User: What shape does this take?
Amino acid sequence: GLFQEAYPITCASDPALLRSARDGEAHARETHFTQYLIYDASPLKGLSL
Amino acid sequence: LVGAMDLTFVLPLGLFNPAMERFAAHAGDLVPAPGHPEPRAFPPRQLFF
Amino acid sequence: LVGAMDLTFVLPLGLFNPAMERFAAHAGDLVPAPGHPEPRAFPPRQLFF
Assistant: This one.
């Protein structure tokens, strides 16, 4: 309501390139040739969810 | 005293990496089987999450 | 008070990777002897456990 913003999720355009996320943010490869990955900024960021 | 949340999440589908940003962190990072077309290079039409 | 458990299990045999998921996490990852065919690139018929 206030901020008119939305929060992105952990997401990627390759399944192969998504697995690199679940290790943690550090090892994620944000880009490959075209295929890429998006890592979430949420209030849920640090929870088990 | 048990509440609720509403969070809205933004997922892009068909976007395309900029010029500087199309690369691979190494030469052989994800290599398709020898003599096969590499989908990693194509424009992504999908997502995963 | 010493009980028992019943757990099924499910193992796929001859199934076949999707299209995005056929690759090798390195170029030289698992290499046959030079001058031999790759047994890895054939459609898999087996399971190990």
Chain B touches chain A at residues 7-12, 16-17, 21-25, 29-30, 38, 40-44, 46-49 (CB under 8 Å).
